[PDB]
Structures are given as C-alpha cells and as structure tokens.
C-alpha cells in the first residue's frame, strides 16, 4: 500500500467558540498515520468538501472511511466523491471498524486539548497538528511526518525536541501531546 | 543550509469569475522545491490569508515569506500574525534583487498561466483547482531534474498516482488541464 491511499475522517466538537469555529475535521492517512486538522463552523458537507479539496490537491485517495454523520452521507458529498473517483466506506453494523479505539482515543485527547483551551484553540490548532505528526509512535517506530516526508529527510525543524517552538503555551502543548498521544 | 519550508513566495491572483463564492486564489510557492499550494478565497484580505496560511503552517512554520506590498500582506494584523510565529516578512521593492529578475519572471510566468487556466473555466475553476495544483506539482522540471512533489515528499517516496502520463485522471475535463499544464509550465 501507499500514503494517501486511504483516509479515515471524523468531526470533533462542538468545541468552545474560538474565532468563530466550533468543529474540527480530523483526517488521518491510513498508512503513515499523518493527521490533518481543518477547523470548521459546522459539521457540514460544504465544510467537509472545502477542507478535502485542499487536502486532495496533494493526492486523490482511493478510499475514505467515516462514520455515517450527515456531512458524509449526503448526496452532495456522494457526488463530490464520485466525481473525484473516491470510493466512500462507512462504518456499518456489519462492517468492521484497535481500528476504532485507536481513532477514539486520539479524538478524545484532541477534544480534551481544544476544550481545555477555550478561546485560543483555533490559533493553537496548527501547533496541535504539528506536534501530533512529529511525535514518535510505538506502533509505527517513526513519526508520521517521517513516514510521509521521508525518514532521513532534512526536516523544517532546527530542533526536533522543541520543533522550533518558543512560546510557553505552545511548548506546554507539545509536552502534553508528546506524553499523552500513545499512552 | 536550505530546506523545504525555509522560504515561501506568495501572491494573490484574481479577481476571477465567481466560482462557488470564491474570487481569488492565494498562490504559495516553496522556494527550495518549487512546490505550489493553491488556496481559493472570497477576497485578497488579511483574514483570508491568515486562514489559508494557518492550514499550511500546520505542516511547518516557514522562516521567510516573500510577497508584494499588497494591502493584505502589509497590514499590522498580518505583521502581528507573522511576528507571533517568528516568520520574517519580506517585501518586493524597486531595489529588491528577487523582483525584476529570474525569480520574478518565473513567478510571473506561473501566475499568468494559473490565471489563464482559471478564467477559462468561469463557473468550474473552483472544482478544478485541486487538479491544477496536483498537475503543477507532479510535472517534471528541467531546472530541478525532478518534480516539486518528489522534492518535497522525497525522491524515492511513493508517487500518489499510478499512471505517470495521466496522473490517474479519467475525466477529459481534467486531462485537458493536465495537457495544458504539461505543455506550458516550463515552456513559457
Ligand atoms: Mn462522527
Ligand atoms: Mn499581488
């Protein structure tokens, strides 16, 4: 298999109103575990399509998996997916999601972090993403960023422990994610 | 010791025909790899620029962003967004080496081409924007010897597509775009 071949996606929220945003679309690459976070106003098809058009400008996935939230089961979303050539796969009573709990724990953690920062979470979201993808996974044996961008690639970060963060609210965020993500 | 995400070039193109609520595209180019991000927006405003760049900087914080002195980029709101993130903002001036040179010509060529492709599909360019970006980043550069995608994600890393010639695109609406891009990109 390959990166960008399959995505798992879900909405978290409603979150505390931060700069007018109430939800985050969480999209995870199935192979590398690389996570993209897209803040939105609603868990809607429109916002889902907006976000995924940005993501799928990089590569078009073979498959996307989600639960049956309204955003994902609409005929509009279905038509978007059909046109792009993307097969949609839903969590069904007869379909097998580990494969569910992994996502559940990370989304729980995600929600805790964002709700725990009521008015700043929107501005910190980019730091959350960055921190998650540059955190070592015991399952992977590398970080998701290493797996997407190349293990021995020269990274954008001068300091792999701080990730070139300097602000205290950001550094404590990185500390909290590093110690909670897979434990 | 140059690396991806060291330096961004950014600019707006537009106004374009209003496709699904959008009138502009923020064009961001990584200086090392030549990898291009395209973000559709309703306006060439600070708030649109911040919103778009917040998505991009979820991947990495650039050290320098180079733009013209457009109102969106010289506002104090945008200065504070950048200062808070340790991003150095650099502006085109009449005595700046990168404007009126090889860097400017290459950037202006790209943006002329982008504009042409989008204005040519007044109602549907928004739907096709992701195909434009894909095709740009997965076309070979004689200058580089590689594609921008190879340069950003790794030369030996897995190609997103499966068919090199078509990039897995099946609709002729998309294959038309790919042909234009392949023909025109580095033959300006
Ligand atoms: Mn859900
Ligand atoms: Mn401009």
PDB file of N, CA and C in Angstrom, chain A residues 1-4 21 31 34 36-39 41 49-50 53-54 56-60 83-84 122-123 125-126 129-130 133-134 145 147-150 153-158 167 169-170, chain B residues 1-6 22 35 37-40 50-51 54-55 57-61 84-85 126-127 129-131 133-134 137-138 149 152-154 157-162 169 171 174:
ATOM      1  N   UNK A   1       0.822  -1.246   0.000  1.00  0.00           N
ATOM      2  CA  UNK A   1       0.000   0.000   0.000  1.00  0.00           C
ATOM      3  C   UNK A   1       0.841   1.275   0.000  1.00  0.00           C
ATOM      4  N   UNK A   2       0.179   2.430   0.068  1.00  0.00           N
ATOM      5  CA  UNK A   2       0.890   3.700  -0.023  1.00  0.00           C
ATOM      6  C   UNK A   2       0.242   4.849   0.757  1.00  0.00           C
ATOM      7  N   UNK A   3       1.027   5.900   1.071  1.00  0.00           N
ATOM      8  CA  UNK A   3       0.459   7.100   1.695  1.00  0.00           C
ATOM      9  C   UNK A   3      -0.585   7.715   0.776  1.00  0.00           C
ATOM     10  N   UNK A   4      -1.630   8.303   1.358  1.00  0.00           N
ATOM     11  CA  UNK A   4      -2.711   8.955   0.599  1.00  0.00           C
ATOM     12  C   UNK A   4      -3.648   7.955  -0.073  1.00  0.00           C
ATOM     13  N   UNK A  21     -15.142  29.315  15.244  1.00  0.00           N
ATOM     14  CA  UNK A  21     -15.099  27.911  14.818  1.00  0.00           C
ATOM     15  C   UNK A  21     -15.587  26.990  15.924  1.00  0.00           C
ATOM     16  N   UNK A  31      -1.900   4.717   6.057  1.00  0.00           N
ATOM     17  CA  UNK A  31      -0.558   4.138   6.074  1.00  0.00           C
ATOM     18  C   UNK A  31       0.414   4.783   7.072  1.00  0.00           C
ATOM     19  N   UNK A  34      -0.422  10.105   9.414  1.00  0.00           N
ATOM     20  CA  UNK A  34      -0.343  11.570   9.306  1.00  0.00           C
ATOM     21  C   UNK A  34      -1.745  12.174   9.418  1.00  0.00           C
ATOM     22  N   UNK A  36      -4.343  15.505   9.475  1.00  0.00           N
ATOM     23  CA  UNK A  36      -4.643  16.895   9.132  1.00  0.00           C
ATOM     24  C   UNK A  36      -5.850  17.337   9.936  1.00  0.00           C
ATOM     25  N   UNK A  37      -5.774  18.555  10.454  1.00  0.00           N
ATOM     26  CA  UNK A  37      -6.861  19.134  11.208  1.00  0.00           C
ATOM     27  C   UNK A  37      -7.369  20.362  10.460  1.00  0.00           C
ATOM     28  N   UNK A  38      -8.665  20.373  10.167  1.00  0.00           N
ATOM     29  CA  UNK A  38      -9.308  21.504   9.491  1.00  0.00           C
ATOM     30  C   UNK A  38     -10.406  22.064  10.361  1.00  0.00           C
ATOM     31  N   UNK A  39     -10.219  23.290  10.880  1.00  0.00           N
ATOM     32  CA  UNK A  39     -11.276  23.901  11.677  1.00  0.00           C
ATOM     33  C   UNK A  39     -12.452  24.338  10.793  1.00  0.00           C
ATOM     34  N   UNK A  41     -16.951  25.684  10.863  1.00  0.00           N
ATOM     35  CA  UNK A  41     -18.037  26.285  11.619  1.00  0.00           C
ATOM     36  C   UNK A  41     -19.129  25.264  11.905  1.00  0.00           C
ATOM     37  N   UNK A  49     -16.259  19.343   2.133  1.00  0.00           N
ATOM     38  CA  UNK A  49     -15.824  19.456   0.729  1.00  0.00           C
ATOM     39  C   UNK A  49     -14.749  20.529   0.600  1.00  0.00           C
ATOM     40  N   UNK A  50     -14.922  21.639   1.311  1.00  0.00           N
ATOM     41  CA  UNK A  50     -13.936  22.721   1.298  1.00  0.00           C
ATOM     42  C   UNK A  50     -12.562  22.208   1.771  1.00  0.00           C
ATOM     43  N   UNK A  53     -11.008  19.380  -0.548  1.00  0.00           N
ATOM     44  CA  UNK A  53     -10.457  19.950  -1.784  1.00  0.00           C
ATOM     45  C   UNK A  53      -9.038  20.474  -1.575  1.00  0.00           C
ATOM     46  N   UNK A  54      -8.789  21.030  -0.400  1.00  0.00           N
ATOM     47  CA  UNK A  54      -7.429  21.466  -0.064  1.00  0.00           C
ATOM     48  C   UNK A  54      -6.512  20.234   0.075  1.00  0.00           C
ATOM     49  N   UNK A  56      -6.905  17.048  -0.999  1.00  0.00           N
ATOM     50  CA  UNK A  56      -6.808  16.242  -2.215  1.00  0.00           C
ATOM     51  C   UNK A  56      -6.206  17.002  -3.383  1.00  0.00           C
ATOM     52  N   UNK A  57      -5.800  18.251  -3.150  1.00  0.00           N
ATOM     53  CA  UNK A  57      -4.905  18.923  -4.095  1.00  0.00           C
ATOM     54  C   UNK A  57      -3.502  18.296  -4.059  1.00  0.00           C
ATOM     55  N   UNK A  58      -3.174  17.612  -2.962  1.00  0.00           N
ATOM     56  CA  UNK A  58      -1.866  16.929  -2.823  1.00  0.00           C
ATOM     57  C   UNK A  58      -1.881  15.562  -3.510  1.00  0.00           C
ATOM     58  N   UNK A  59      -2.948  14.806  -3.244  1.00  0.00           N
ATOM     59  CA  UNK A  59      -3.192  13.492  -3.846  1.00  0.00           C
ATOM     60  C   UNK A  59      -4.651  13.100  -3.652  1.00  0.00           C
ATOM     61  N   UNK A  60      -5.194  12.343  -4.604  1.00  0.00           N
ATOM     62  CA  UNK A  60      -6.564  11.836  -4.531  1.00  0.00           C
ATOM     63  C   UNK A  60      -6.560  10.432  -3.926  1.00  0.00           C
ATOM     64  N   UNK A  83     -17.298  12.135  -8.472  1.00  0.00           N
ATOM     65  CA  UNK A  83     -16.575  12.918  -9.476  1.00  0.00           C
ATOM     66  C   UNK A  83     -15.053  12.814  -9.338  1.00  0.00           C
ATOM     67  N   UNK A  84     -14.559  12.774  -8.103  1.00  0.00           N
ATOM     68  CA  UNK A  84     -13.115  12.675  -7.858  1.00  0.00           C
ATOM     69  C   UNK A  84     -12.596  11.249  -8.035  1.00  0.00           C
ATOM     70  N   UNK A 122      -8.381  27.596  18.317  1.00  0.00           N
ATOM     71  CA  UNK A 122      -8.258  27.838  16.887  1.00  0.00           C
ATOM     72  C   UNK A 122      -6.833  28.264  16.515  1.00  0.00           C
ATOM     73  N   UNK A 123      -6.255  29.213  17.261  1.00  0.00           N
ATOM     74  CA  UNK A 123      -4.905  29.719  16.939  1.00  0.00           C
ATOM     75  C   UNK A 123      -3.819  28.682  17.210  1.00  0.00           C
ATOM     76  N   UNK A 125      -4.424  25.306  17.005  1.00  0.00           N
ATOM     77  CA  UNK A 125      -4.681  24.124  16.141  1.00  0.00           C
ATOM     78  C   UNK A 125      -3.479  23.731  15.265  1.00  0.00           C
ATOM     79  N   UNK A 126      -2.850  24.706  14.572  1.00  0.00           N
ATOM     80  CA  UNK A 126      -1.683  24.347  13.766  1.00  0.00           C
ATOM     81  C   UNK A 126      -0.535  23.735  14.574  1.00  0.00           C
ATOM     82  N   UNK A 129      -1.502  20.022  15.326  1.00  0.00           N
ATOM     83  CA  UNK A 129      -1.266  19.138  14.196  1.00  0.00           C
ATOM     84  C   UNK A 129       0.209  18.784  14.118  1.00  0.00           C
ATOM     85  N   UNK A 130       1.026  19.832  14.145  1.00  0.00           N
ATOM     86  CA  UNK A 130       2.471  19.741  14.027  1.00  0.00           C
ATOM     87  C   UNK A 130       3.048  18.831  15.115  1.00  0.00           C
ATOM     88  N   UNK A 133       2.020  14.993  14.513  1.00  0.00           N
ATOM     89  CA  UNK A 133       2.735  14.359  13.407  1.00  0.00           C
ATOM     90  C   UNK A 133       4.250  14.204  13.593  1.00  0.00           C
ATOM     91  N   UNK A 134       4.798  14.931  14.559  1.00  0.00           N
ATOM     92  CA  UNK A 134       6.212  14.835  14.865  1.00  0.00           C
ATOM     93  C   UNK A 134       6.428  14.233  16.246  1.00  0.00           C
ATOM     94  N   UNK A 145       5.241  12.198  10.301  1.00  0.00           N
ATOM     95  CA  UNK A 145       5.921  13.119   9.394  1.00  0.00           C
ATOM     96  C   UNK A 145       7.091  12.420   8.708  1.00  0.00           C
ATOM     97  N   UNK A 147       7.354   9.318   8.022  1.00  0.00           N
ATOM     98  CA  UNK A 147       6.820   8.345   7.071  1.00  0.00           C
ATOM     99  C   UNK A 147       6.242   8.991   5.817  1.00  0.00           C
ATOM    100  N   UNK A 148       5.684  10.190   5.948  1.00  0.00           N
ATOM    101  CA  UNK A 148       5.143  10.891   4.783  1.00  0.00           C
ATOM    102  C   UNK A 148       6.248  11.588   3.991  1.00  0.00           C
ATOM    103  N   UNK A 149       7.149  12.270   4.704  1.00  0.00           N
ATOM    104  CA  UNK A 149       8.171  13.096   4.063  1.00  0.00           C
ATOM    105  C   UNK A 149       9.548  12.448   3.932  1.00  0.00           C
ATOM    106  N   UNK A 150       9.692  11.197   4.367  1.00  0.00           N
ATOM    107  CA  UNK A 150      10.982  10.503   4.253  1.00  0.00           C
ATOM    108  C   UNK A 150      11.684  10.490   5.593  1.00  0.00           C
ATOM    109  N   UNK A 153      14.931  12.513   5.654  1.00  0.00           N
ATOM    110  CA  UNK A 153      14.794  13.828   5.033  1.00  0.00           C
ATOM    111  C   UNK A 153      15.173  14.917   6.015  1.00  0.00           C
ATOM    112  N   UNK A 154      15.828  15.952   5.504  1.00  0.00           N
ATOM    113  CA  UNK A 154      16.117  17.140   6.301  1.00  0.00           C
ATOM    114  C   UNK A 154      14.814  17.893   6.552  1.00  0.00           C
ATOM    115  N   UNK A 155      14.403  17.905   7.814  1.00  0.00           N
ATOM    116  CA  UNK A 155      13.111  18.430   8.201  1.00  0.00           C
ATOM    117  C   UNK A 155      13.162  19.951   8.277  1.00  0.00           C
ATOM    118  N   UNK A 156      11.986  20.601   8.336  1.00  0.00           N
ATOM    119  CA  UNK A 156      11.936  22.055   8.529  1.00  0.00           C
ATOM    120  C   UNK A 156      12.352  22.518   9.936  1.00  0.00           C
ATOM    121  N   UNK A 157      12.523  21.578  10.862  1.00  0.00           N
ATOM    122  CA  UNK A 157      12.792  21.919  12.257  1.00  0.00           C
ATOM    123  C   UNK A 157      14.270  21.871  12.575  1.00  0.00           C
ATOM    124  N   UNK A 158      14.769  22.979  13.110  1.00  0.00           N
ATOM    125  CA  UNK A 158      16.138  23.062  13.596  1.00  0.00           C
ATOM    126  C   UNK A 158      16.297  22.199  14.849  1.00  0.00           C
ATOM    127  N   UNK A 167       7.102  29.966  22.340  1.00  0.00           N
ATOM    128  CA  UNK A 167       6.050  30.429  23.240  1.00  0.00           C
ATOM    129  C   UNK A 167       5.653  29.339  24.244  1.00  0.00           C
ATOM    130  N   UNK A 169       2.833  28.638  25.956  1.00  0.00           N
ATOM    131  CA  UNK A 169       1.555  27.945  25.767  1.00  0.00           C
ATOM    132  C   UNK A 169       1.681  26.873  24.669  1.00  0.00           C
ATOM    133  N   UNK A 170       2.578  27.124  23.722  1.00  0.00           N
ATOM    134  CA  UNK A 170       2.844  26.188  22.641  1.00  0.00           C
ATOM    135  C   UNK A 170       3.748  25.032  23.097  1.00  0.00           C
TER     136      UNK A 170
ATOM    137  N   UNK B   1      21.911  26.441   4.935  1.00  0.00           N
ATOM    138  CA  UNK B   1      21.637  25.041   4.606  1.00  0.00           C
ATOM    139  C   UNK B   1      20.167  24.850   4.227  1.00  0.00           C
ATOM    140  N   UNK B   2      19.835  25.185   2.981  1.00  0.00           N
ATOM    141  CA  UNK B   2      18.443  25.330   2.544  1.00  0.00           C
ATOM    142  C   UNK B   2      17.613  24.050   2.623  1.00  0.00           C
ATOM    143  N   UNK B   3      16.355  24.210   3.021  1.00  0.00           N
ATOM    144  CA  UNK B   3      15.429  23.095   3.110  1.00  0.00           C
ATOM    145  C   UNK B   3      14.001  23.523   2.750  1.00  0.00           C
ATOM    146  N   UNK B   4      13.136  22.547   2.427  1.00  0.00           N
ATOM    147  CA  UNK B   4      11.725  22.860   2.216  1.00  0.00           C
ATOM    148  C   UNK B   4      11.166  23.632   3.411  1.00  0.00           C
ATOM    149  N   UNK B   5      10.287  24.596   3.135  1.00  0.00           N
ATOM    150  CA  UNK B   5       9.653  25.438   4.154  1.00  0.00           C
ATOM    151  C   UNK B   5      10.568  26.498   4.761  1.00  0.00           C
ATOM    152  N   UNK B   6      11.744  26.697   4.178  1.00  0.00           N
ATOM    153  CA  UNK B   6      12.606  27.804   4.587  1.00  0.00           C
ATOM    154  C   UNK B   6      12.036  29.131   4.098  1.00  0.00           C
ATOM    155  N   UNK B  22     -16.096  31.990  -4.528  1.00  0.00           N
ATOM    156  CA  UNK B  22     -14.681  32.368  -4.497  1.00  0.00           C
ATOM    157  C   UNK B  22     -14.265  33.256  -5.669  1.00  0.00           C
ATOM    158  N   UNK B  35       7.359  23.622  -4.937  1.00  0.00           N
ATOM    159  CA  UNK B  35       6.031  23.068  -4.657  1.00  0.00           C
ATOM    160  C   UNK B  35       5.037  24.191  -4.426  1.00  0.00           C
ATOM    161  N   UNK B  37       1.150  25.588  -3.417  1.00  0.00           N
ATOM    162  CA  UNK B  37      -0.152  25.423  -2.794  1.00  0.00           C
ATOM    163  C   UNK B  37      -1.120  26.463  -3.331  1.00  0.00           C
ATOM    164  N   UNK B  38      -2.357  26.042  -3.587  1.00  0.00           N
ATOM    165  CA  UNK B  38      -3.396  26.948  -4.083  1.00  0.00           C
ATOM    166  C   UNK B  38      -4.564  26.975  -3.115  1.00  0.00           C
ATOM    167  N   UNK B  39      -4.865  28.163  -2.589  1.00  0.00           N
ATOM    168  CA  UNK B  39      -5.986  28.351  -1.666  1.00  0.00           C
ATOM    169  C   UNK B  39      -7.018  29.337  -2.212  1.00  0.00           C
ATOM    170  N   UNK B  40      -8.215  28.831  -2.576  1.00  0.00           N
ATOM    171  CA  UNK B  40      -9.275  29.731  -3.019  1.00  0.00           C
ATOM    172  C   UNK B  40      -9.812  30.580  -1.851  1.00  0.00           C
ATOM    173  N   UNK B  50      -4.458  34.723   6.502  1.00  0.00           N
ATOM    174  CA  UNK B  50      -4.182  34.074   7.787  1.00  0.00           C
ATOM    175  C   UNK B  50      -4.841  32.682   7.863  1.00  0.00           C
ATOM    176  N   UNK B  51      -6.132  32.622   7.531  1.00  0.00           N
ATOM    177  CA  UNK B  51      -6.895  31.373   7.471  1.00  0.00           C
ATOM    178  C   UNK B  51      -6.199  30.312   6.588  1.00  0.00           C
ATOM    179  N   UNK B  54      -2.621  29.420   8.074  1.00  0.00           N
ATOM    180  CA  UNK B  54      -2.777  28.579   9.249  1.00  0.00           C
ATOM    181  C   UNK B  54      -2.921  27.090   8.914  1.00  0.00           C
ATOM    182  N   UNK B  55      -3.530  26.796   7.767  1.00  0.00           N
ATOM    183  CA  UNK B  55      -3.647  25.408   7.284  1.00  0.00           C
ATOM    184  C   UNK B  55      -2.267  24.927   6.837  1.00  0.00           C
ATOM    185  N   UNK B  57       0.755  26.140   7.608  1.00  0.00           N
ATOM    186  CA  UNK B  57       1.755  26.115   8.671  1.00  0.00           C
ATOM    187  C   UNK B  57       1.415  25.084   9.735  1.00  0.00           C
ATOM    188  N   UNK B  58       0.374  24.293   9.484  1.00  0.00           N
ATOM    189  CA  UNK B  58       0.129  23.118  10.302  1.00  0.00           C
ATOM    190  C   UNK B  58       1.190  22.047  10.012  1.00  0.00           C
ATOM    191  N   UNK B  59       1.797  22.147   8.833  1.00  0.00           N
ATOM    192  CA  UNK B  59       2.833  21.243   8.372  1.00  0.00           C
ATOM    193  C   UNK B  59       4.193  21.692   8.870  1.00  0.00           C
ATOM    194  N   UNK B  60       4.508  22.975   8.645  1.00  0.00           N
ATOM    195  CA  UNK B  60       5.743  23.602   9.134  1.00  0.00           C
ATOM    196  C   UNK B  60       5.671  25.128   9.058  1.00  0.00           C
ATOM    197  N   UNK B  61       6.315  25.783  10.012  1.00  0.00           N
ATOM    198  CA  UNK B  61       6.427  27.240  10.038  1.00  0.00           C
ATOM    199  C   UNK B  61       7.580  27.700   9.151  1.00  0.00           C
ATOM    200  N   UNK B  84       4.295  36.817  15.826  1.00  0.00           N
ATOM    201  CA  UNK B  84       3.946  35.822  16.829  1.00  0.00           C
ATOM    202  C   UNK B  84       4.482  34.419  16.507  1.00  0.00           C
ATOM    203  N   UNK B  85       4.762  34.166  15.223  1.00  0.00           N
ATOM    204  CA  UNK B  85       5.214  32.851  14.748  1.00  0.00           C
ATOM    205  C   UNK B  85       6.679  32.840  14.329  1.00  0.00           C
ATOM    206  N   UNK B 126     -13.200  26.521  -9.522  1.00  0.00           N
ATOM    207  CA  UNK B 126     -13.042  26.149  -8.126  1.00  0.00           C
ATOM    208  C   UNK B 126     -12.973  24.637  -7.994  1.00  0.00           C
ATOM    209  N   UNK B 127     -13.916  23.935  -8.635  1.00  0.00           N
ATOM    210  CA  UNK B 127     -13.920  22.472  -8.649  1.00  0.00           C
ATOM    211  C   UNK B 127     -12.625  21.876  -9.173  1.00  0.00           C
ATOM    212  N   UNK B 129      -9.543  23.397  -9.141  1.00  0.00           N
ATOM    213  CA  UNK B 129      -8.324  23.926  -8.518  1.00  0.00           C
ATOM    214  C   UNK B 129      -7.395  22.818  -7.994  1.00  0.00           C
ATOM    215  N   UNK B 130      -7.951  21.783  -7.329  1.00  0.00           N
ATOM    216  CA  UNK B 130      -7.086  20.703  -6.819  1.00  0.00           C
ATOM    217  C   UNK B 130      -6.350  19.932  -7.908  1.00  0.00           C
ATOM    218  N   UNK B 131      -6.931  19.867  -9.108  1.00  0.00           N
ATOM    219  CA  UNK B 131      -6.306  19.193 -10.260  1.00  0.00           C
ATOM    220  C   UNK B 131      -5.182  20.051 -10.819  1.00  0.00           C
ATOM    221  N   UNK B 133      -3.322  22.128  -8.994  1.00  0.00           N
ATOM    222  CA  UNK B 133      -2.223  22.011  -8.033  1.00  0.00           C
ATOM    223  C   UNK B 133      -1.488  20.681  -8.203  1.00  0.00           C
ATOM    224  N   UNK B 134      -2.257  19.595  -8.258  1.00  0.00           N
ATOM    225  CA  UNK B 134      -1.710  18.260  -8.469  1.00  0.00           C
ATOM    226  C   UNK B 134      -0.836  18.200  -9.715  1.00  0.00           C
ATOM    227  N   UNK B 137       2.496  20.212  -9.427  1.00  0.00           N
ATOM    228  CA  UNK B 137       3.483  19.647  -8.519  1.00  0.00           C
ATOM    229  C   UNK B 137       4.019  18.285  -8.940  1.00  0.00           C
ATOM    230  N   UNK B 138       3.431  17.726  -9.994  1.00  0.00           N
ATOM    231  CA  UNK B 138       3.761  16.388 -10.454  1.00  0.00           C
ATOM    232  C   UNK B 138       4.147  16.396 -11.928  1.00  0.00           C
ATOM    233  N   UNK B 149       6.834  17.690  -6.175  1.00  0.00           N
ATOM    234  CA  UNK B 149       6.341  16.701  -5.216  1.00  0.00           C
ATOM    235  C   UNK B 149       7.471  15.768  -4.738  1.00  0.00           C
ATOM    236  N   UNK B 152       9.638  17.699  -2.322  1.00  0.00           N
ATOM    237  CA  UNK B 152       9.076  17.987  -1.002  1.00  0.00           C
ATOM    238  C   UNK B 152       8.853  16.725  -0.167  1.00  0.00           C
ATOM    239  N   UNK B 153       8.334  15.684  -0.803  1.00  0.00           N
ATOM    240  CA  UNK B 153       7.954  14.494  -0.058  1.00  0.00           C
ATOM    241  C   UNK B 153       9.031  13.412  -0.051  1.00  0.00           C
ATOM    242  N   UNK B 154      10.054  13.557  -0.893  1.00  0.00           N
ATOM    243  CA  UNK B 154      11.131  12.551  -1.004  1.00  0.00           C
ATOM    244  C   UNK B 154      11.189  11.965  -2.402  1.00  0.00           C
ATOM    245  N   UNK B 157      10.112   8.354  -2.308  1.00  0.00           N
ATOM    246  CA  UNK B 157       8.802   8.150  -1.678  1.00  0.00           C
ATOM    247  C   UNK B 157       7.742   7.735  -2.712  1.00  0.00           C
ATOM    248  N   UNK B 158       6.638   7.160  -2.240  1.00  0.00           N
ATOM    249  CA  UNK B 158       5.573   6.659  -3.116  1.00  0.00           C
ATOM    250  C   UNK B 158       4.849   7.752  -3.894  1.00  0.00           C
ATOM    251  N   UNK B 159       4.868   7.657  -5.225  1.00  0.00           N
ATOM    252  CA  UNK B 159       4.090   8.569  -6.061  1.00  0.00           C
ATOM    253  C   UNK B 159       2.621   8.417  -5.680  1.00  0.00           C
ATOM    254  N   UNK B 160       1.910   9.548  -5.503  1.00  0.00           N
ATOM    255  CA  UNK B 160       0.490   9.480  -5.144  1.00  0.00           C
ATOM    256  C   UNK B 160      -0.307   8.715  -6.205  1.00  0.00           C
ATOM    257  N   UNK B 161      -0.145   9.126  -7.459  1.00  0.00           N
ATOM    258  CA  UNK B 161      -0.783   8.495  -8.613  1.00  0.00           C
ATOM    259  C   UNK B 161      -0.222   7.097  -8.928  1.00  0.00           C
ATOM    260  N   UNK B 162      -0.710   6.510 -10.023  1.00  0.00           N
ATOM    261  CA  UNK B 162      -0.237   5.215 -10.515  1.00  0.00           C
ATOM    262  C   UNK B 162       0.215   5.309 -11.974  1.00  0.00           C
ATOM    263  N   UNK B 169      -5.998  10.518 -13.726  1.00  0.00           N
ATOM    264  CA  UNK B 169      -7.183  11.309 -14.039  1.00  0.00           C
ATOM    265  C   UNK B 169      -7.933  10.656 -15.187  1.00  0.00           C
ATOM    266  N   UNK B 171     -11.446  11.848 -16.243  1.00  0.00           N
ATOM    267  CA  UNK B 171     -12.316  12.789 -16.945  1.00  0.00           C
ATOM    268  C   UNK B 171     -11.493  13.689 -17.862  1.00  0.00           C
ATOM    269  N   UNK B 174     -10.416  17.077 -16.883  1.00  0.00           N
ATOM    270  CA  UNK B 174      -9.176  17.085 -16.107  1.00  0.00           C
ATOM    271  C   UNK B 174      -7.933  16.817 -16.964  1.00  0.00           C
TER     272      UNK B 174
END
